[PDB]
Scaffold this active site. Structure first.
Site: not given
Ligand SMILES: O=C(NO)c1ccc(Cl)c(NC(=O)c2cccc3ccsc23)c1
Ligand SMILES: [K+]
Ligand SMILES: [Zn+2]
Ligand SMILES: [K+]
Length: 399
Positions: A99, A141, A175
């Protein structure tokens, strides 16, 4: 004044990643379409006088080997040849994979957020701005020697380090995800109090910020930083009012007891009901959005404050929220009515706001009492340990 971080190269770099695409451009172009730019003071991203000076800034948190590996990842992704097995293993040892993949601008993109948030800290320190916004930052993160969650360099930690070394800082993480990298960086530091509200559930990223798995207890800092890391995990489906009532008294009690010299707010937009995560049900509504309730409360403290971005995977709706956050900040800080039209103005990205082209997002709307009791006791313990005095009953009355 209210500062906001942008510039031409900065925009190109913030738009150069595969995951976040052109989100930053939609955000800044909607703020500009609403005629908010003349109200704001542009804060230019920081630039350094030498590679050595850049490394000195970034390795205030990150290890040199990790920064070297992230720079090599960029260089390798700028050649056509595949990586060698040895280079794959090197990248694996920093979690620069899966990721957190490489791409041709991965170092310049990651460093840009650091440049923006460090410049934002500096503007607060020299008192040029009372609040500074950086919608290209908020990458909470990233760890000392590890990429995580598409966060490669922790611009928040580096900004907070600048602020505290210039003093107590209150960090507030709105967040959907637990702000684990920032929490961990300051785990042993009582002068940086961290507070994250987030979803947590088994298997949900990153897995921390909740009961720790003897009977599961809540860890909250260590050494002289004991009791200094706060967390509020919530189950899915929470709406504006309940999320607002959940964190409102915690925020007010933290400001009363900590009396911070600076507030740093991470405002990741993935709590919106329309985010593809589809976990929380917050809105950008403004008659109330949990986000705007929180930001308004924080700004009412009249503490110099840094507002950062973060997650948000519905790009038009993230622009819709952050455009309202930006207008609210202008109103609270300058004292000057901001009249936003309920219709998206015509501009380069107007077509992305279909099919209705409104500023409101397209959404129609015991466990927390236990957490408040736990959090109150922790704040009392934190205050006790750090010889801070405050009206206990006036604080207890907030809840
Ligand atoms: O924002 C984050 N941290 O603060 C965060 C960190 C790691 C991940 Cl894995 C995700 N999200 C996705 O990768 C994702 C999940 C569900 C649907 C979609 C559509 C586009 S990305 C996504 C978020
Ligand atoms: K948070
Ligand atoms: Zn997030
Ligand atoms: K801490």
């Amino acid at each position: 004044s209210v500062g906001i971080v942008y510039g031409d190269q900065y925009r190109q770099l913030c738009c150069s990643s595969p995951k976040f695409g052109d989100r930053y451009a939609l955000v800044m172009d909607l703020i500009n379409a609403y005629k908010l730019i003349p109200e704001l003071s542009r804060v230019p991203p920081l630039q350094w006088d030498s590679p050595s000076r850049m490394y000195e800034a970034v390795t205030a948190f990150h290890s040199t080997e990790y920064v070297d590996a992230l720079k090599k990842l960029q260089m390798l992704h700028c050649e056509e040849k595949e990586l060698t097995a040895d280079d794959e293993l090197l990248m694996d040892s920093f979690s620069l994979n899966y990721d957190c993949p490489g791409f041709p601008s991965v170092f310049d993109y990651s460093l840009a957020a650091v440049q923006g948030s460090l410049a934002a800290a500096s503007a607060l320190i020299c008192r040029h701005c009372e609040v500074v916004i950086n919608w290209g930052g908020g990458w909470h993160h990233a760890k000392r020697s590890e990429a995580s969650g598409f966060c490669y360099l922790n611009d928040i930690v580096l900004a907070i380090h600048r602020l505290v070394s210039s003093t107590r800082v209150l960090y507030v993480d709105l967040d959907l995800h637990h702000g684990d990298g920032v929490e961990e960086a300051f785990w042993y530091s009582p002068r940086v109090v961290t507070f994250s509200v987030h979803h947590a559930s088994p298997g949900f990223f990153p897995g921390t910020g909740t009961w720790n798995m003897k009977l599961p207890i809540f860890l909250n800092g260590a050494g002289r930083g004991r009791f200094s890391a706060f967390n509020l995990p919530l189950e899915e489906g929470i709406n504006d009012l309940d999320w607002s009532n959940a964190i409102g008294p915690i925020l007010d009690s933290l400001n009363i007891v900590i009396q911070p010299s600076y507030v740093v707010v991470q405002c990741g937009a993935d709590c919106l009901a329309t985010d593809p995560h589809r976990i929380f049900r917050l809105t950008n509504f403004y008659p109330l959005s949990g986000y705007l309730y929180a930001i308004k409360k924080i700004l009412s403290w009249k503490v110099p404050t840094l507002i950062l971005g973060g997650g948000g995977y519905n790009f038009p709706d993230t622009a819709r929220l952050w455009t309202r956050v930006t207008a609210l900040t202008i109103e609270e800080v300058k004292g000057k009515k901001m009249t936003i039209s309920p219709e998206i103005p015509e501009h380069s990205y107007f077509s992305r706001y279909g099919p209705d082209f409104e500023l409101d997002i397209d959404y129609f709307p015991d466990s927390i009492q236990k957490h408040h009791r736990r959090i109150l006791e922790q704040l009392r313990n934190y205050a006790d340990l750090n010889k801070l005095i405050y009206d206990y009953d006036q604080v207890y009355q907030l809840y």
